[PDB]
Design a protein around this ligand. Structure first.
Ligand SMILES: [Mg+2]
Ligand SMILES: [Mg+2]
Ligand SMILES: [Zn+2]
Ligand SMILES: [Zn+2]
Lengths: 166, 166
């Protein structure tokens, strides 16, 4: 077997263990916030938002889109883990703006021999509108209560800035 | 006073803008890895694994479980954005250990007056078995090519340590 970047991460983790020492924080996030954002490698959510360890739940998927898994995860965050505020954070230069479902599902048929023509990969073109659509999906879900403040924002991957949309 | 904790994140972000400066990184992660892990507020993935900005996609949900949205997001990460390695990272003291689906269904009747008895919240008991179950869901998906490198691991929230699971 050939080593990969996982082995690099295991080695690098030793330094973090030495800094972290032995210290327990509560399962319930201190700020009562859950953030929904993209997986993008150029977004490190804690320094961008000023999070201390234990401050907020961080949910991440392709595009920061609201899905059944995001709602599942938020109902656990809120009803089991005490959170009561949501931030939907999309970002500039997102991979979701680089394909359409039709073009991507043709590519998958060619490359993987799978027909995913009926599956929605959740692309978008207008970042602000994508944030407003995902906030509406949360507000229309009966699993997300009404006394939950939901904010929308955009992270600029070139500058580090977070700016409100919703 | 501010209206929500989001407003404190916006204020804290000004120091991060000053540090970040203006700098573009590629969409394709430098290490070609996607990490799948839990939303837990006590896991800051970049310092734990030594990631620089731009190094790895980070997918997070409740428990770090493989779902339809995780596969959607990994197919985008791999087939559109060039990753070729996955790390499945669960952790100690996870909220997914604190309920069974029947117990959480009863809690949601109390908390929301909604009946979610048909929905699978994906809890687990044994943490290594939960990593192995998630890796087998990836290996059995025709949407994740057989040549993708997959490893499993557990993060100890009290010590900072990541250890490999086989
Ligand atoms: Mg517009
Ligand atoms: Mg993260
Ligand atoms: Zn993105
Ligand atoms: Zn967890």
């Amino acid at each position: 077997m050939v080593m990969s970047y996982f082995d690099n991460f295991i080695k690098a983790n030793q330094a973090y263990v030495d800094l972290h020492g032995t210290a327990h924080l509560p399962l319930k996030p201190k700020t009562r916030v859950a953030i929904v954002t993209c997986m993008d490698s150029r977004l490190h959510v804690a320094p961008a938002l000023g999070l201390a360890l234990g401050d907020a739940h961080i949910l991440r998927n392709a595009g920061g889109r609201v899905t059944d898994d995001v709602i599942r995860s938020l109902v656990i965050s809120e009803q089991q883990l005490g959170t009561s505020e949501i931030v939907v954070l999309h970002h500039t230069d997102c991979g979701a703006q680089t394909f359409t479902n039709a073009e991507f599902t043709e590519q998958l048929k060619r490359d993987l021999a799978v027909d995913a023509g009926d599956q929605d990969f959740l692309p978008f073109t207008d970042i602000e509108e994508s944030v407003r659509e995902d906030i509406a999906l949360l507000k229309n879900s009966p699993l997300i209560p009404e006394d939950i403040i939901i904010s929308g924002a955009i992270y600029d991957v070139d500058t580090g800035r977070v700016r409100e949309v919703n």
